[PDB]
Amino acid sequence: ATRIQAVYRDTGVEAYRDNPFIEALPPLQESVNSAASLKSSLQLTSSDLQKSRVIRAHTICRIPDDYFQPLGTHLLLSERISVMIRGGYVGRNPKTGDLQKHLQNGYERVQTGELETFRFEEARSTAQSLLLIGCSGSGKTTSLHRILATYPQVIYHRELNVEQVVYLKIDCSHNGSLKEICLNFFRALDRALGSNYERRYGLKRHGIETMLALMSQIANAHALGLLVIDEIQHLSRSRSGGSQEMLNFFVTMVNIIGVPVMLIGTPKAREIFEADLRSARRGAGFGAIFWDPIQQTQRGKPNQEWIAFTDNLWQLQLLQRKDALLSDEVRDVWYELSQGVMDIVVKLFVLAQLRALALGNERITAGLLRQVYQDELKPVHPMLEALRSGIPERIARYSDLVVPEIDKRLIQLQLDIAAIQEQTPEEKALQELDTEDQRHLYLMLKEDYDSSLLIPTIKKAFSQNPTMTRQKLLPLVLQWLME
Amino acid sequence: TRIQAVYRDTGVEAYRDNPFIEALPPLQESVNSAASLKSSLQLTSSDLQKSRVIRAHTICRIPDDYFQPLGTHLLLSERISVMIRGGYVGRNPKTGDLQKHLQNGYERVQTGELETFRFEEARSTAQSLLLIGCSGSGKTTSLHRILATYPQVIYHRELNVEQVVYLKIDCSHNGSLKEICLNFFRALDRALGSNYERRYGLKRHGIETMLALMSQIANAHALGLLVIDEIQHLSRSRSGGSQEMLNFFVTMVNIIGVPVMLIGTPKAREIFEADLRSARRGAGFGAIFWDPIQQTQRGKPNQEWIAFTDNLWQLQLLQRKDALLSDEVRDVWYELSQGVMDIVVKLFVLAQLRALALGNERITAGLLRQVYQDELKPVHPMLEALRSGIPERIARYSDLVVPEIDKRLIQLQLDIAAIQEQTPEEKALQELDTEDQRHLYLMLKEDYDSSLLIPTIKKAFSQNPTMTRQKLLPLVLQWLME
Amino acid sequence: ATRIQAVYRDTGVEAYRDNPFIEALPPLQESVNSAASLKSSLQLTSSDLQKSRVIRAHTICRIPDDYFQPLGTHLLLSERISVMIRGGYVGRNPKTGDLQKHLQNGYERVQTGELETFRFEEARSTAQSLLLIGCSGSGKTTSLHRILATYPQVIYHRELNVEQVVYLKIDCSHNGSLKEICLNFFRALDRALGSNYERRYGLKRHGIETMLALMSQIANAHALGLLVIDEIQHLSRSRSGGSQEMLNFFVTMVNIIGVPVMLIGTPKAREIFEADLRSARRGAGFGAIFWDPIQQTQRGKPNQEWIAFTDNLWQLQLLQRKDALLSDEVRDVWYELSQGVMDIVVKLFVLAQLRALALGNERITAGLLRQVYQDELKPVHPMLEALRSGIPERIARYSDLVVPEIDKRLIQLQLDIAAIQEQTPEEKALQELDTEDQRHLYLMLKEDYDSSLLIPTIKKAFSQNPTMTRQKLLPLVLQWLME
Amino acid sequence: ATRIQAVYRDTGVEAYRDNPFIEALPPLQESVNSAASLKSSLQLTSSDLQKSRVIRAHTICRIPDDYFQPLGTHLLLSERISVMIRGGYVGRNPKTGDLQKHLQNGYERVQTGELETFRFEEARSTAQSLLLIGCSGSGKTTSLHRILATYPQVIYHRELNVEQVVYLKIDCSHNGSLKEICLNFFRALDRALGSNYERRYGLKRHGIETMLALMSQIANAHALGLLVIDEIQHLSRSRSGGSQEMLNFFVTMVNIIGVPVMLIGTPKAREIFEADLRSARRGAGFGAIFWDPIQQTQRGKPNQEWIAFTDNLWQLQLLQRKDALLSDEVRDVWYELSQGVMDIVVKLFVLAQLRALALGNERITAGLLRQVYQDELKPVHPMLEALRSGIPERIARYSDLVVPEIDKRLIQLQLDIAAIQEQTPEEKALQELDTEDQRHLYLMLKEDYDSSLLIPTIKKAFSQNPTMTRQKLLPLVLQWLME
Ligand SMILES: Nc1ncnc2c1ncn2[C@@H]1O[C@H](COP(=O)(O)OP(=O)(O)O)[C@@H](O)[C@H]1O
Ligand SMILES: Nc1ncnc2c1ncn2[C@@H]1O[C@H](COP(=O)(O)OP(=O)(O)O)[C@@H](O)[C@H]1O
Ligand SMILES: Nc1ncnc2c1ncn2[C@@H]1O[C@H](COP(=O)(O)OP(=O)(O)O)[C@@H](O)[C@H]1O
Ligand SMILES: Nc1ncnc2c1ncn2[C@@H]1O[C@H](COP(=O)(O)OP(=O)(O)O)[C@@H](O)[C@H]1O
Ligand SMILES: [Mg+2]
Ligand SMILES: [Mg+2]
Ligand SMILES: [Mg+2]
Ligand SMILES: [Mg+2]
């Protein structure tokens, strides 16, 4: 817990003035560019490629979990979360009276006192609930985990005696029930704070009503900012009951708890909320934000976003015979085969390296991509063909495919490439130099100039000029290279 | 929302000692009841200088928080007040000496000194009103804002009743007569804290059994109004025809003592036009009609249109703004929107949302015409029918509405957010287009410093076109070094 | 009842150290020596006899309220209250987190090897509930009220932000149920603390199961020292659940809340709890203290307790022709008349004194006492005869009987007293003598010498005595009267 | 208790090598060193001597609840409990994942002909059982809530999801029904894990066989380690069936359920198991332990255990007039009246101290011991006389006697000690008067003159003059008072 003494700032908005829970948050000015400052990528040096195959394979296997590239939706979602969190605190000011007394005083002052008019609207504050919908693998969880890391989870105050829980995350389990969510709420709260609410409130004897009341009480004890319930797809409609009962429980939970609630799910989870979204009555809530794959055709032009994403990842290939330019057909094949879904796009790039490391030459070709698509990514065929077809019901049915058990498959592929003793000509050429630190110059000089006299002339020149930097001897080698 | 009751007197002699009527906000004149509904956004000059995404969000937040009270809301407010306060006169629970009074009256009529007597005042008048008008005219927001003045639940200390003042129901997209009964309980256990839906809304019950169960509950808490919204959405095939809906809506008024209000589209009146059972019961208190705004009702143009357009125009967030609104712009709005409330606001919002994307940042007639042509496609026949003026064509296309407008707003925001990136770096690489140059830059990015590396090589390429990449390396390296 | 800033003193006991809650309580040593100093009495003056009938009747009317004699059981109950209140704060010291961290730390330290052994004994200190059983009218409620008034109800901590509630009391009503107990807890908490919890939690939606959890959370929030449920005899038996459901509810309430709990009831309510405390299990809790009537005899001798109580009550005689000392016959018949019940002992005396004053033959004797017994105590005959019979089963059935509506009878008898106008010979002499000092002399010398020479001699003597007090005047009149 | 997170420690035995359940338990200890870990005593021995009598009585009443001293027979029981708990976990190893491949490889090799013999799997047969027999009052439960108090009850495993219930304790009922033994298992498992087994299984109408086949399924999901059944005497043909089914139920239970079972009973409960070789084979599966009272001497010289038990308890004496050392006559009388039963030794001490406080004598002699033995220990006399006799049959027939309701006697004695009175000097000065005349004169002349010399003057008036009437005495009394 980043327990920091509450240091209070000045906010431009008059509504957020003198609220001790909002000045404790990081300022907006530094959060303007923090949304776009989420970029993170691996750093590669020249000597990494010259090293042995095991470390190169390890670095290749480290790619999927160490690469992030933000998009426009990562900015829109960041701004939405910031405004939601900062607007959900306006009603819960400890320095001002509660809502019910305000309403009662207004009623007395409009009937007995002097006041021309009043608005008996719910003072519950904004509390804008939201529902995030997207196909599996689009990159929803990995975006929440990166845009919710700016705010510290727990902030401690000293003028009062409270502990502010800025956000809380609940992750569902497969084939769970409604009561499992209630248990997980207390479990996550005890993990975050270090309390013992689970023992005295998370017993299995309690009914749903008692657990909901206790959740409301405890969430109003510690000032809670946001509640995120992830992976709604795993809930089962057999034991829980009808889909109407699930919606009733979700609406009851949202109304009682009194804090902003965000739900993340797939289109298969939309059939539960279909009746709620279409109704236009205020108070139903659950605004919808849809995550979509990167469509290459916008306004009759290739996307600058698509090429920007592909070029950066194309710069991150560890190949001996790699092609610097990404051709139009090479760009098009691994879009038309993967349909732009976020995980499959990087899955091809990480798996084609492994396939090429054993199947022959170290070059990425369309045939190799087709072969890896056909032999490895078997379960995800219906989802990809549904996305290619473009019929919404077909995509809705064939979603949730997550190509199970890729973690063990990566390890098995690593073990498979581990037991290879054949020597490539490139390995022989690299071994012909005894770590003289000159295979780097040889690397820039191998793609065009022939190797008939490349290495002997290089060795002769570096022997003639023993102690200078490689930048100095590169013109020296080039002087007699063509003469 | 549990508000304790505070009693105040009213000048009406018919409501002398009624707690239900005396625990309500006081009676008001014409000016305040119509001027209390006004609401608008407040903007500051600091909002003008901000990032484009926040400005787009503020623009998209306009239709939710803007309301202008016209001259047709005063009548609706007055009628709703009369309906709510007049339906409680026969339901006051203060009956202290009824038994002795009735017994004395009976003992006196038998002897012969008293000719006649009235044992029970059967105050059971069925009051109702139906409000029909074209879609997009604002029958839902104009009702929410009127009803947001009374408290919903009032608690009386002396008694044990919870006076649920009003209740609102919305119909489903296909809909049947059973689901209205199922939604009554589902909204009543949301207004209060209860579990009526599981206890009473079973499947074993028929339509009549739930219709009779609703009466006991609506008389347990002194319900004051019942609003059924969007009767246009009901399907005439899953309900029983065009007659069993009318029978349902006429039997509903008689048994349930509360006043009811029915809201629909002009093509949904064909259900209700068959008989007096809703031409008299439904129009037991009139039938208010909503119409689009007319530009020139008299010889002079209407001041309502001018005031509405001016007040809408004063919420513009653009660097290049024109304070004076041109007459041609007014003509363009009246020609494209034809006075429908839902079209004017969307046209304005979409125009000033596309202005940021195109970068002009000024609203012109051509932009409004283009956004009307591009975005308002499904609602064209309704506009044409309103322009023609034939009642049948107006009735037939009265249910048109543009689908998926919110997704369009989100996509329009995303396009601007993608555009916003200035990209000060990589500008020289944008200037770099030749394949040989890009390969050379990739080769020499680590060796040299790119900032002065990129511009220099373009001159060398421009001077001598008939040179290859391989042979250019020594000369380019020599020029870079010295 | 009013907020008091906490003042931290020092306690000599080692276990009650560094605890904000215990040190803020009143000091232990001062309370020890003042446990038997709660004795109160309605003081009388020598001049009170000389005033009229109405004023003296009004003065006699105040005896049942302005009198309290501390008996043996009062000290034991005081000690039990003290230990129960101050022993339940050991496990809730704010300086240390809780016992779970202690248990985990001990487990880790014994697993590592630095600690030989650890006792997972579930340390809870005393943590014992108490059950009070006694016949109606024994005087439990008054003693409890007078012993709980020493501790201030609410003390405010400024260094912390908690509201210590030292005790809380709940009073039942006729034919009540459990939900009234749950709601009355909140109502009493609002009346004592000064905030509004009834309007937020007193909702008809909640069942009793959820209300108990809310009670537990709120009580743990405020550090509730002690909970006293009173007059459980009044609530109906079969209206709620019968016998098993009420016992189950009481056990659940005792287990969940975690603060000391006391119950007060009649022997007729003991059969609810007979199934629990009779089992030979010292860890089941529910210790019992039995209240018993005062016994005249002890190991063959009259106990000093009853004799001292009767003497102190007889010291307050206010009557015209009353006797001086207490006779053996009247004292012995008083035991058969009242049988030791606290209410009957004082009420018989008050009623007999009032009747003697009203009759005009004011001298309380055995016959007047018996007449009052058979006149006013008709309803409570079965309880008295069952208690005198000594059958342990019949006393339980009639233990709930109580004298109905006696307050109105006192007013009616006072109105009857005000109606009389006849003048007794003592009142005739009172009208004859103007000086109150002379009236006292007449009163003390009334029985030895009759008014044949009494009134004239003292009248002329005090008339001729110009100005002097009684101290030397009385000896001077003695020889003149004797001559 | 409570969900303690597991921390693994290695075990030196080869067979316990890789079992999480065995490793999460507290480390192995030597038998001699483990028996000394059970000792406990009161810490208030000298600091609390000078205080009021009721507080001292309240302190004394807690001697038989917090004083425990191990004997030489506890180390064997501790070793047996440890071996029984840890040795029943070898067949329940959860951490195995290479079974399928190994079994299939063995099958292939034995089918081809490379390998001759193989062993696939074997089921477990029977669980260890133990029997403990001894007379009542010997300490078979106080000495076993402390052996099992050095273990956690519930342990949570992070990598798995099992909650290892280390042990569980249930008691038989007076009815002896076989359906209330399968119904306390669920209740005791619910009172520890906070689960809902009793509603799901017990309340439905199931046969004893079906409900016994469900007790071995929830004792496997939670890796239960030991099951203790107390008061096994109550199945001696008490009710509910015939002897043959009552004997078949235990055999089927031991055969079915996988956990070890321990049985505790009275010397009249070996007739149940001494009926056929199956019952005596299963009751004495891991030895049988028979317990006997303490003897004064074994071979000539007196027992040292008696000396150590009657010397570490005599120190806990809160009396002003105590003796430093034990007179041998007092100890001999104590052994004559106690005969070695654990319960009688403590009670003859606490009751003697309470009577000493009540009567005002602050020292303990043999007379008080004999008086308490004759008065307050009537119901257990046949057992003590049979033990003194020496005939084994009379000892065996009276091994079930127990004294009921001694806590009520303790409370009554505390009340008697509380009600002693203070004898304030003014009341005793008034009590010095021995006639109605002196009291009459004092009451007549109390207010006029000071009471500092009133009593001596009145006493001297009657002392100097033998007797004469009060009316003429009063002029002399006032003359003496004035001068
Ligand atoms: N904007 C992005 N830039 C780079 N990689 C991304 C991006 N979004 C998602 N990914 C990759 O997609 C992979 C899988 O995403 P995942 O968290 O499984 O999405 P979901 O939880 O919706 O299935 C992650 O390993 C992550 O590296
Ligand atoms: N008087 C008004 N002033 C401003 N906006 C209005 C007014 N009346 C309606 N609107 C706009 O019309 C939009 C839709 O109206 P709605 O209530 O949906 O009408 P209907 O229910 O008949 O379709 C609302 O977003 C609201 O902003
Ligand atoms: N020690 C005492 N001295 C004087 N009066 C007493 C004493 N104990 C009880 N009383 C009398 O008992 C009455 C109250 O009895 P109460 O406590 O209500 O009995 P219960 O609790 O059984 O209903 C008071 O009016 C009081 O005068
Ligand atoms: N080793 C011991 N030291 C001191 N007291 C003991 C010891 N063993 C037993 N006792 C006493 O024996 C009393 C009764 O034991 P109990 O649990 O009733 O055994 P059982 O149930 O076999 O009769 C307890 O109060 C306890 O104080
Ligand atoms: Mg996910
Ligand atoms: Mg509408
Ligand atoms: Mg009472
Ligand atoms: Mg026992």
Side-chain angles (χ1 to χ4, degrees), chain D residues 403-430:
Chain D
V403 58
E405 306 187 341
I406 202 67
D407 44 353
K408 286 105 187 173
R409 191 68 208 177
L410 293 168
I411 291 286
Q412 292 179 352
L413 282 153
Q414 288 183 26
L415 269 177
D416 200 290
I417 297 169
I420 294 300
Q421 298 296 325
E422 78 286 335
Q423 305 306 94
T424 180
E426 68 275 16
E427 206 170 16
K428 78 183 183 179
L430 201 161

Side-chain angles (χ1 to χ4, degrees), chain C residues 28-29 32 36 46 70-76 79-80 83 99-100 103-104 107-108 110-113 115-122 255 270 277-282 288-292 298-299 304-305 308 311-312 315 323-326 328 440 443-445 447-449 470-472 474-475 478-479 482, chain D residues 1-9 23-27 29 33 37 51-52 54-55 58 64-65 141-142 145-146 149-152 155 167 169 171 191 230-231 359 405 407-408 411-412 414-416 418-421 423 427 431 435-436 439-440 443-449 470-472 474-475 478-479 482:
Chain C
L28 189 55
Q29 263 204 340
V32 160
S46 65
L71 287 193
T73 71
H74 184 46
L75 178 56
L76 185 68
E79 295 299 326
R80 291 301 272 266
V83 70
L99 73 165
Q100 161 73 16
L103 289 181
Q104 185 78 69
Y107 179 61
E108 288 180 341
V110 70
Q111 280 271 51
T112 49
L115 194 50
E116 290 301 332
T117 177
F118 189 43
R119 287 193 39 83
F120 303 85
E121 67 184 358
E122 282 303 84
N255 280 48
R270 189 182 172 183
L277 59 88
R278 296 289 220 181
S279 63
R281 196 89 153 154
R282 62 181 190 259
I289 302 174
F290 299 95
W291 270 70
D292 266 12
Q298 190 74 30
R299 51 183 52 101
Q304 184 178 2
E305 182 148 19
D311 197 303
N312 281 138
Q315 192 259 339
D323 58 356
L325 211 53
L326 183 63
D328 273 31
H440 213 281
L443 280 181
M444 48 208 288
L445 273 75
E447 93 283 8
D448 298 324
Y449 310 110
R470 196 172 68 193
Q471 65 183 357
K472 186 183 286 185
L474 195 156
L478 284 172
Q479 74 270 17
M482 171 75 168
Chain D
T2 300
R3 272 87 153 189
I4 286 173
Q5 317 270 338
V7 164
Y8 305 93
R9 183 89 189 280
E23 279 178 353
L25 291 179
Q29 275 169 10
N33 188 274
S37 170
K51 198 174 288 294
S52 177
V54 57
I55 297 89
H58 173 66
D65 205 9
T141 303
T142 309
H145 291 171
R146 288 180 177 256
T150 183
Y151 287 93
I155 292 175
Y167 60 87
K169 195 149 178 306
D171 279 20
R191 285 200 293 102
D230 204 332
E231 300 183 357
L359 268 71
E405 306 187 341
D407 44 353
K408 286 105 187 173
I411 291 286
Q412 292 179 352
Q414 288 183 26
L415 269 177
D416 200 290
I420 294 300
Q421 298 296 325
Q423 305 306 94
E427 206 170 16
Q431 199 182 357
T435 193
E436 275 87 13
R439 278 177 173 89
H440 273 97
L443 264 68
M444 281 185 108
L445 309 165
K446 191 190 55 168
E447 280 312 291
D448 291 331
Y449 307 104
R470 183 201 71 241
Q471 293 93 346
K472 185 70 168 62
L474 181 137
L478 276 75
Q479 195 286 324
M482 212 76 227

